[PDB]
Amino acid sequence: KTIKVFTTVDNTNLHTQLVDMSMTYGQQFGPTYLDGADVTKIKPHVNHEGKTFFVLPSDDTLRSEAFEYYHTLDESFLGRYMSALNHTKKWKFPQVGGLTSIKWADNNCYLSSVLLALQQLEVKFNAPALQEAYYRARAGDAANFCALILAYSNKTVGELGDVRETMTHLLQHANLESAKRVLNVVHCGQKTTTLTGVEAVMYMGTLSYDNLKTGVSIPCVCGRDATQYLVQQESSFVMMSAPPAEYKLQQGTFLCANEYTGNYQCGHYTHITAKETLYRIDGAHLTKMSEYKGPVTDVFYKETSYTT
Amino acid sequence: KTIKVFTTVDNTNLHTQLVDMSMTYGQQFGPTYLDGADVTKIKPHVNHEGKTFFVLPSDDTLRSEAFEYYHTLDESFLGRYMSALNHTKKWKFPQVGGLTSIKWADNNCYLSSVLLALQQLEVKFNAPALQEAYYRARAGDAANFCALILAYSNKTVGELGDVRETMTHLLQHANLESAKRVLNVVHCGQKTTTLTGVEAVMYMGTLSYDNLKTGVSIPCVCGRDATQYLVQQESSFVMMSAPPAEYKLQQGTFLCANEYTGNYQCGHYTHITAKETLYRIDGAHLTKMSEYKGPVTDVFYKETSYTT
Ligand SMILES: *[C@H](CC(=O)Nc1cccnc1)C(=O)NNC(=O)CCc1ccccc1C(=O)N[C@H](C)Cc1cccc2ccccc12
Ligand SMILES: *[C@H](CC(=O)Nc1cccnc1)C(=O)NNC(=O)CCc1ccccc1C(=O)N[C@H](C)Cc1cccc2ccccc12
């Protein structure tokens, strides 16, 4: 009933242990975490041999730093953070196109594009732990960042993610009230709305800021075809996201964008950024072009302020 | 290739005609309408024997009154209005509980409750044609009203309707800008919105004004559980509509309500109104109780104004 397993508590040294398939990991080790999860209540699985679990021998006052350093009220948070940081360190982050991409491993797509896109944005987080990493990530010590990206998103190493939904969780912890967007929709009746923070910088429906500024079609109204348009946006960038579609990107049209090529929950994120000429990144790789044409789910535009 | 069919152009006199199954109704009669529809492009169906079609021998300047009298830019509108008014007259509207219900015929449910509920509301339409009928409907000459209710909703005699979706089309033509509602939703980010007219008096989500005023749970936020609540409502009544659910009605709690007992698009609307004691109407019928307990999709509350 034994499987060989590596146990680190410091992520510096490792230890080799044996574990009973008959007992919960907690019974034998205490609180235990593997690849971003909380296996502390789980019996051992035979696929788990040859893996490195992060064990955290419990503590009642580590919550000093917890809500402080990490801005979370999850007892599990650090156990998930660290057991991912083990793996995350094993990835290779090379600086490419000036930014810092992630050699594909354990399904990095979303994390690459998320990280490829969070350099280029004017954003400062309200949890110190992110600040450090972001800047370790710009220089190249990004393993701390992807680990927190996982833990904030509640994701596991190797679990596919949607780039859009991931940032929702990172943007909850950043400079929010500083930002403002206003929109009005109109047939019979009419409706104007203002959103603060993350709400204000994220849109689901079109990839074109211009259309949002021009015209964009919305339901109920009374029947089915109102128009909604942007009235005011007070924020440093904008994210425009739609179900993946074919789209046109030109230099200076857009900050950056990322290209999803697959089915609903099975696809491939590829990040494009606009510099000298368009620069497309896929893991370590890169293609640079003066035209694009592909399938995009997300486009990025820098912006100062706009009033209608 | 002949079926016997009755042709009125004045809805006073009838004529008996024969029609070729080989030709479109227009080829033989001109523009032709049956039971609220525009059969003028359709070949005859053999079920159509023994029916009374409304024929409108075309006209280019009847649009004088059209957008005027009826507030529509449908050439078909009057042809649909009148061919329904034929049938609608054949129904029996008895005044019950003080209001005026509709003896069940051709699936009246929604029209009964809609009509049972549009007496009790403080609303004045912006098309004269409705004004007349509404008041013919309060006295009992309601056939003109249900006919327009059909034509405004684009429904046919005998086609089941959702009470909620029907009023959307009648409320497009009523006192709108006079009314105002404001709502704010809040996790990370926050969002406040104002709606004008019909938008402002109709809600989909709960049956309880009180909850809307108390608390009501809404998605995205960042994750999935914001709270939205009512800030200001400036209007004469309120409609609260939800997918049909079990609900509690007490006298003086609510203006009126209607009870849907069936599957999604196959069910039964039953209207309840609060007077001396609760008064439930089903076609001509009526039960009056001091308690209720049933399945409701729509509840009505009179209101003057409210500020948070
Ligand atoms: C990595 C994929 C990968 O590893 N590719 C390989 C590289 C090298 C070698 N082999 C393979 C990855 O992270 N993929 N992410 C992923 O699948 C996430 C999809 C997902 C997950 C959760 C929620 C939503 C989604 C999602 O649908 N995302 C796409 C971009 C949005 C989308 C797609 C299709 C239809 C649709 C409709 C409406 C809204 C979005 C939408
Ligand atoms: C009449 C039914 C009838 O004739 N009953 C009889 C009387 C005497 C003798 N025999 C029979 C009628 O008009 N029924 N209306 C109807 O079926 C309309 C349903 C409908 C139609 C179009 C769009 C929506 C709907 C609808 O679903 N309405 C219900 C009230 C809302 C509902 C119901 C179930 C689930 C659900 C979920 C979400 C939102 C609404 C919702």
XYZ file of N, CA and C in Angstrom, chain B residues 184-262:
237
model
N -28.639 49.612 -8.242
C -27.205 49.469 -8.128
C -26.889 48.033 -7.739
N -25.862 47.476 -8.371
C -25.345 46.162 -8.028
C -23.909 46.353 -7.543
N -23.409 45.389 -6.776
C -22.073 45.549 -6.205
C -21.087 44.491 -6.737
N -19.122 41.687 -4.794
C -17.666 41.632 -4.747
C -17.021 42.855 -5.394
N -15.934 42.620 -6.125
C -15.091 43.709 -6.586
C -15.646 44.351 -7.852
N -15.401 45.664 -7.970
C -16.200 46.540 -8.802
C -17.561 46.830 -8.174
N -18.279 47.780 -8.779
C -19.669 48.058 -8.432
C -20.306 48.747 -9.618
N -21.642 48.718 -9.659
C -22.372 49.080 -10.875
C -23.768 49.597 -10.552
N -24.029 50.826 -10.987
C -25.304 51.500 -10.805
C -25.852 51.902 -12.166
N -27.161 51.688 -12.346
C -27.805 51.819 -13.642
C -29.167 52.490 -13.475
N -29.555 53.329 -14.450
C -30.906 53.895 -14.511
C -31.593 53.583 -15.838
N -32.867 53.205 -15.737
C -33.693 52.778 -16.852
C -34.911 53.676 -16.983
N -35.281 53.998 -18.218
C -36.444 54.834 -18.466
C -37.600 54.008 -19.011
N -38.814 54.463 -18.695
C -40.013 53.855 -19.240
C -40.153 52.395 -18.843
N -40.819 51.628 -19.717
C -41.086 50.194 -19.550
C -39.921 49.468 -18.871
N -38.693 49.687 -19.358
C -37.493 49.179 -18.699
C -37.575 49.366 -17.190
N -38.061 50.537 -16.762
C -38.034 50.912 -15.358
C -39.103 50.214 -14.527
N -40.201 49.755 -15.117
C -41.270 49.188 -14.297
C -41.297 47.663 -14.303
N -40.509 47.018 -15.166
C -40.500 45.568 -15.321
C -39.188 44.959 -14.843
N -39.290 43.898 -14.040
C -38.134 43.172 -13.530
C -38.307 41.664 -13.734
N -37.214 40.987 -14.105
C -37.187 39.530 -14.244
C -36.173 38.958 -13.271
N -36.657 38.152 -12.323
C -35.803 37.619 -11.286
C -36.523 37.241 -10.012
N -37.327 38.136 -9.454
C -38.069 37.823 -8.240
C -39.495 38.338 -8.331
N -40.344 37.773 -7.473
C -41.724 38.196 -7.336
C -41.898 39.232 -6.237
N -40.889 39.427 -5.380
C -41.020 40.273 -4.196
C -40.374 41.622 -4.469
N -41.200 42.675 -4.482
C -40.681 44.035 -4.401
C -39.765 44.150 -3.201
N -40.246 43.656 -2.057
C -39.508 43.740 -0.802
C -38.081 43.250 -0.963
N -37.892 42.099 -1.602
C -36.531 41.624 -1.804
C -35.746 42.580 -2.682
N -36.297 42.944 -3.833
C -35.633 43.959 -4.632
C -35.206 45.127 -3.766
N -36.093 45.559 -2.865
C -35.767 46.642 -1.939
C -34.789 46.183 -0.862
N -34.839 44.899 -0.489
C -33.965 44.327 0.530
C -32.631 43.927 -0.078
N -32.660 42.880 -0.892
C -31.459 42.345 -1.493
C -31.835 41.329 -2.558
N -31.054 41.318 -3.620
C -31.312 40.374 -4.702
C -29.986 40.038 -5.381
N -29.787 38.756 -5.673
C -28.465 38.241 -6.018
C -28.279 38.111 -7.526
N -27.123 38.558 -8.000
C -26.871 38.819 -9.415
C -25.476 38.293 -9.743
N -25.184 37.961 -11.003
C -23.873 37.392 -11.322
C -22.801 38.402 -11.727
N -21.975 37.989 -12.700
C -20.573 38.383 -12.849
C -19.957 38.961 -11.595
N -20.391 40.155 -11.200
C -19.664 40.928 -10.213
C -18.237 40.924 -10.724
N -17.397 40.156 -10.019
C -16.188 39.527 -10.525
C -16.382 38.023 -10.682
N -16.800 37.340 -9.607
C -17.193 35.938 -9.645
C -18.653 35.669 -9.992
N -19.521 35.455 -8.990
C -20.893 35.024 -9.284
C -22.011 35.546 -8.377
N -21.730 36.232 -7.243
C -22.782 36.620 -6.284
C -22.611 38.075 -5.840
N -23.024 39.002 -6.700
C -23.193 40.376 -6.270
C -24.509 40.487 -5.538
N -24.765 41.664 -5.001
C -26.114 42.006 -4.610
C -26.545 43.212 -5.422
N -27.775 43.171 -5.917
C -28.402 44.334 -6.515
C -29.638 44.664 -5.697
N -29.942 45.954 -5.624
C -31.053 46.446 -4.827
C -31.615 47.674 -5.517
N -32.839 48.018 -5.152
C -33.511 49.160 -5.745
C -33.079 50.431 -5.012
N -32.713 51.461 -5.770
C -32.312 52.735 -5.183
C -33.468 53.726 -5.239
N -33.998 53.949 -6.435
C -35.151 54.809 -6.626
C -36.059 54.204 -7.689
N -37.366 54.299 -7.449
C -38.387 53.950 -8.427
C -39.425 55.057 -8.438
N -39.604 55.695 -9.586
C -40.581 56.769 -9.748
C -41.620 56.302 -10.769
N -42.646 55.606 -10.285
C -43.658 55.091 -11.190
C -44.888 54.698 -10.393
N -45.995 54.536 -11.130
C -47.337 54.400 -10.564
C -47.653 52.991 -10.071
N -47.018 51.964 -10.641
C -47.144 50.581 -10.182
C -45.807 49.900 -10.391
N -45.750 48.615 -10.075
C -44.588 47.819 -10.446
C -45.015 46.413 -10.832
N -44.325 45.883 -11.828
C -44.445 44.495 -12.214
C -43.197 43.762 -11.778
N -43.390 42.682 -11.050
C -42.310 41.797 -10.669
C -42.618 40.437 -11.259
N -41.706 39.927 -12.072
C -41.940 38.676 -12.772
C -40.768 37.728 -12.575
N -41.087 36.467 -12.350
C -40.072 35.438 -12.240
C -40.558 34.177 -12.929
N -39.652 33.283 -13.307
C -40.055 31.930 -13.667
C -40.986 31.374 -12.605
N -42.031 30.651 -13.002
C -43.127 30.392 -12.071
C -42.608 29.660 -10.857
N -43.069 30.104 -9.693
C -42.597 29.584 -8.427
C -43.757 29.613 -7.452
N -43.606 28.874 -6.357
C -44.577 28.936 -5.271
C -44.369 30.225 -4.476
N -45.462 30.909 -4.141
C -45.331 32.223 -3.523
C -46.506 32.478 -2.589
N -46.315 33.450 -1.699
C -47.275 33.796 -0.656
C -47.876 35.173 -0.931
N -49.203 35.229 -1.066
C -49.928 36.481 -1.262
C -50.917 36.708 -0.123
N -50.922 37.922 0.438
C -51.847 38.292 1.505
C -52.564 39.587 1.140
N -53.715 39.846 1.771
C -54.504 40.991 1.333
C -53.744 42.260 1.694
N -53.777 43.250 0.809
C -53.006 44.445 1.047
C -51.509 44.305 0.859
N -50.994 43.090 0.627
C -49.578 42.936 0.305
C -49.284 43.395 -1.111
N -50.224 43.168 -2.026
C -49.982 43.277 -3.458
C -51.228 43.771 -4.173
N -51.005 44.489 -5.267
C -52.101 44.854 -6.143
C -52.759 43.586 -6.662
N -52.195 42.976 -7.698
C -52.735 41.721 -8.194
C -51.587 40.832 -8.672
N -51.934 39.606 -9.085
C -50.966 38.588 -9.494
C -51.639 37.550 -10.391
N -50.818 36.782 -11.122
C -51.342 35.745 -12.009
C -50.503 34.467 -11.951
N -51.202 33.326 -12.009
C -50.688 32.031 -11.570
C -50.569 31.077 -12.750
N -49.340 30.673 -13.054
C -49.041 29.843 -14.211
C -48.849 28.400 -13.757
N -49.677 27.504 -14.284
C -49.691 26.108 -13.874
C -49.520 25.259 -15.134
N -48.266 24.986 -15.491
C -47.965 24.086 -16.595
C -46.473 24.066 -16.903
